[PDB]
Amino acid sequence: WNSNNLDSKVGGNYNYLYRLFRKSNLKPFERDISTEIYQAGSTPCNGVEGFNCYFPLQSYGFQPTNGVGYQPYRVVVLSFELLHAPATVCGPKKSTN
Amino acid sequence: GEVFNATRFASVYAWNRKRISNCVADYSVLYNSASFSTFKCYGVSPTK
Numbered sequence: 001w002n003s004n005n006l007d008s009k010v011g012g013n014y015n016y017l018y019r020l021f022r023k024s025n026l027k028p029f030e031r032d033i034s035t036e037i038y039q040a041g042s043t044p045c046n047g048v049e050g051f052n053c054y055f056p057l058q059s060y061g062f063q064p065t066n067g068v069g070y071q072p073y074r075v076v077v078l079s080f081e082l083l084h085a086p087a088t089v090c091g092p093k094k095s096t097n
Numbered sequence: 098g099e100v101f102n103a104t105r106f107a108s109v110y111a112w113n114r115k116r117i118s119n120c121v122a123d124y125s126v127l128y129n130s131a132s133f134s135t136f137k138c139y140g141v142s143p144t145k
Contacts, residue, residue, distance in 0.1 A: 021142065040143035042125055051134050054143065 003074035008062040016072070019056035029079075101131045 007013055021038040039045035041052025049055055062072050100115070107113035124143060128136075 041128065052128060052143065 001074060002071065004062070004064050004067050004071045007072045007074070008064040008067055010063065013062040013072075014059040016060050016062070018058065018060065020058065021054045021056050098130065101127075 007016070019032075019035075021040065022032070023038075026032065035056055037045055037047075037049060037053055037055050039050070039052065040054045043052060045053040060072065061070070063070075
């Protein structure tokens, strides 16, 4: 569902980070927060940053009215496993004699 | 390499558009032979 009116700024809300560059892909249901310098070029890259080195620091340019398809959407994915372990979080349905 | 080595480039208001096809291109040699420092790319990795 839409979150432009609560997240987007007129000047651009560059607070929500997204990363494109890493040596290894992301396994399903996993997160990585190591902001290690990524060297796109064949040359060695040391220190904080460098040329031909694309660090994983880029954020959304979220604007309220300018965002049509670029508009932020706040998404919640519900994932569950059934009939593998004893159930704890159960349905509203009441027990019987 | 030649369009990187052109004496005079296309005008601002009268930019010339060009298309090439049916050859082999590499990005490593592009910044090896013709070094640059001012470059940022959208939607594509430099290696991609």
